[PDB]
Amino acid sequence: KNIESLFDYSAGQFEFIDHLLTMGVGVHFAALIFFLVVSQFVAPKYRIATALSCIVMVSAGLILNSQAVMWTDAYAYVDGSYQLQDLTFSNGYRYVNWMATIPCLLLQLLIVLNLKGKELFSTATWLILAAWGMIITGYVGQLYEVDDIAQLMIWGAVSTAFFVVMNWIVGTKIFKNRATMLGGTDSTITKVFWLMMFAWTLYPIAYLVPAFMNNADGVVLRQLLFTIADISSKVIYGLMITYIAIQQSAAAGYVPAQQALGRI
Numbered sequence: 001k002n003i004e005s006l007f008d009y010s011a012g013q014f015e016f017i018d019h020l021l022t023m024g025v026g027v028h029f030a031a032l033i034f035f036l037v038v039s040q041f042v043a044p045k046y047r048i049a050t051a052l053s054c055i056v057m058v059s060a061g062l063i064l065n066s067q068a069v070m071w072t073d074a075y076a077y078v079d080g081s082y083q084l085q086d087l088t089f090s091n092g093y094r095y096v097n098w099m100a101t102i103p104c105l106l107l108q109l110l111i112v113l114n115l116k117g118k119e120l121f122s123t124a125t126w127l128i129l130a131a132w133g134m135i136i137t138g139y140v141g142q143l144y145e146v147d148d149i150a151q152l153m154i155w156g157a158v159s160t161a162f163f164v165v166m167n168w169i170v171g172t173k174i175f176k177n178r179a180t181m182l183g184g185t186d187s188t189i190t191k192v193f194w195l196m197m198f199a200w201t202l203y204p205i206a207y208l209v210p211a212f213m214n215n216a217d218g219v220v221l222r223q224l225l226f227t228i229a230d231i232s233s234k235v236i237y238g239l240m241i242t243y244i245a246i247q248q249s250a251a252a253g254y255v256p257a258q259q260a261l262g263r264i
């Protein structure tokens with residue numbers, strides 16, 4: 001039902017699909033390694049944000065590790081090419097952990113927009129249901145990527161709607177509680193806000209791929225777009241939650257953060 005399964009790829013694409021998935025495991029697990037260590041140095045008010053990116057790294061990490069392992073469990077080499085045997089690839093669990101990863105990835109921002117208590121809990125809840133509506137509508141569209149490109153369009157359309165809606169609430173909180181942030185970080189979160197628009201338009205590109213390269217290296221183009229989105233949605237936004245997170249630790253009195261910024 002997915003467009004991976006339609007294709008007898010050559011050999012070079014597979015190994016490169018094997019290879020996207022593999023450094024993608026490696027890079028998050030290495031990112032993981034690093035949000036753990038500068039945990040000493042966050043004020044215990046943005047500490048959960050850097051800790052939302054140990055969760056995120058081993059979330060994107062398992063799924064991408066599940067997938068590569070499942071990418072290779074899946075295809076022998078037969079009379080030229082790597083062919084579906086009888087154990088299927090499909091990008092379906094990836095939406096599923098975006099059910100967990102999009103959310104978790106938003107509160108750390110919301111934590112670094114210093115949302116707290118009722119307005120942390122209020123903003124957090126609406127971003128999540130908008131994320132979910134986007135995620136499940138999209139999940140059901142790529143369900144017809146072979147069978148029904150028209151609903152893929154239609155369901156993609158609804159999913160987009162929720163995206164628009166959810167960026168509007170992301171940026172509305174930034175571009176408004178911007179000045180409550182400290183450390184000099186009142187600045188870097190509008191900037192961060194545009195990287196996280198770019199990598200989030202990458203998936204709905206990896207999503208219209210079937211209706212414009214219904215072919216084998218269309219499958220590769222699709223997986224090209226995934227790795228990059230995973231790299232700066234999970235990992236590079238996160239590195240910045242910490243830059244934004246450490247600069248607020250430091251500037252409010254956090255002695256370990258003040259001297260963490262000293263030998264840099």
Ligand SMILES: *C\C=C(C)/C=C/C=C(C)/C=C/C1=C(C)CCCC1(C)C
Nearest residue numbers: 102138159160163200203204207233
């Ligand atoms: C891997 C980390 C993140 C934050 C990924 C998020 C996923 C999306 C933004 C995907 C969004 C969709 C949209 C915007 C509309 C078409 C359907 C999609 C599910 C691809």
Ligand SMILES: CCCCCCCC/C=C\CCCCCCCC(=O)O
Nearest residue numbers: 022023024025026027030031034239
């Ligand atoms: C095993 C397959 C390849 C995966 C291993 C990759 C080796 C590390 C490569 C870089 C990934 C990004 C690491 C995050 C940087 C943290 C340090 C920093 O802040 O600059």
Ligand SMILES: CCCCCCCC/C=C\CCCCCCCC(=O)O
Nearest residue numbers: 012013016217220227228229231232
């Ligand atoms: C900023 C995120 C970086 C993502 C890095 C992804 C690595 C891929 C980079 C370019 C690939 C170029 C190699 C050409 C592959 C040809 C495809 C094929 O075999 O048919």
Ligand SMILES: [Cl-]
Nearest residue numbers: 043044045046
């Ligand atoms: Cl504190």
Ligand SMILES: [Cl-]
Nearest residue numbers: 059060097101
């Ligand atoms: Cl993920």
